[PDB]
Amino acid sequence: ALEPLVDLPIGINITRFQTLLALHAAYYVGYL
């Protein structure tokens, strides 16, 4: 199961997102 952390009353209108790794490890995405 998956339990909430955060709500935000921003007003933004997002269309596309991008991750950000770090340097001195795969990752999965999926849609709803």
Partner 1 sequence: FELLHAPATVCGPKKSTNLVKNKCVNFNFNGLTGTGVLTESNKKFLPFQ
For residues 3 and 25, which CB has a smaller minimum distance to partner 1 in the complex? 3
Is the CB of 10 or the CB of 32 nearer to partner 1? Answer: 10
Site for partner 1 in 1-20 (CB under 8 A): 3-4, 9, 11
Number of residues that bind partner 1 (CB under 8 A): 4
Question: Measured in Å, how far apart are the chain's first and last C-alpha atoms?
Answer: 16
- How would you label 7-21 residue by residue, b for 16+ Cβ within 10 Å and e otherwise? eeeeeeeeeeeeeee
Q: Which residues bind partner 1 (CB under 8 A)?
A: 3-4, 9, 11
